[PDB]
């Protein structure tokens, strides 16, 4: 397995054309604020190919 290739799976809005989103802030999926701390309704936005 080669898992060095990553991709964005969680985002608040669709990218505009030819946009480069490099932000790695933890995505919030619930009312409770995340504040950069992982937990319920706080998912890391990156996922690997493998």
């Amino acid at each position, epitope marked *: 397995g*080669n*898992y*060095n290739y*990553l991709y964005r799976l969680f985002r608040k809005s669709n990218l505009k054309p030819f946009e480069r989103d490099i932000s*790695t802030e*933890i995505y919030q999926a619930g009312s409770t604020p995340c504040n*950069g*701390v*992982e*937990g*319920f309704n706080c*998912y*890391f936005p*990156l*996922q*690997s190919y*493998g």
Partner: nanobody, 118 residues
Framework: QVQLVETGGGLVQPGGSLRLSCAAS????????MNWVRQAPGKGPEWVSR????????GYTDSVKGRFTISRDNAKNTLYLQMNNLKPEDTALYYC???????????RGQGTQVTVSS
């Protein structure tokens, strides 16, 4: 481009607890926690151990109870795994993955395979 550079692990004979390092870079590490997870030849991967960012509670399979320990350092931004009473059955790839609650098929690095040599 987040790179989970993992330090190689040489062959270690039984008699001394093995110390292994695994580094991360390219993103804020104090926010999310890191996870140790093992894949052995001839079988699929399985989660080994996890450490919380703030609470710092080490959680790992009871089958590996009393012999695996973790130590995270944000100043150096890396994880260290210590195994005591290492047995041949430990031979596998103890790779690293950015720990999510499920920690299933999440992001991971190449890692290094280590086999205990009698």
């Amino acid at each position: 481009q987040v790179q989970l550079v993992e330090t190689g692990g040489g062959l270690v004979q039984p008699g001394g607890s093995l110390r292994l390092s695994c580094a991360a870079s390219g993103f804020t590490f104090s926010s999310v926690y890191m996870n140790w997870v093992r894949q052995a030849p001839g079988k699929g991967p399985e989660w080994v151990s996890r450490i919380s960012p703030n609470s710092g509670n080490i959680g790992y399979t009871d089958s590996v109870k009393g012999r695996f320990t973790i130590s995270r350092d944000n100043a150096k931004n890396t994880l260290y795994l210590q195994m005591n009473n290492l047995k041949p059955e430990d031979t596998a790839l103890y790779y690293c993955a950015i720990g999510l609650n499920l920690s299933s098929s999440s992001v991971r690095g190449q890692g290094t395979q280590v086999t205990v040599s009698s």
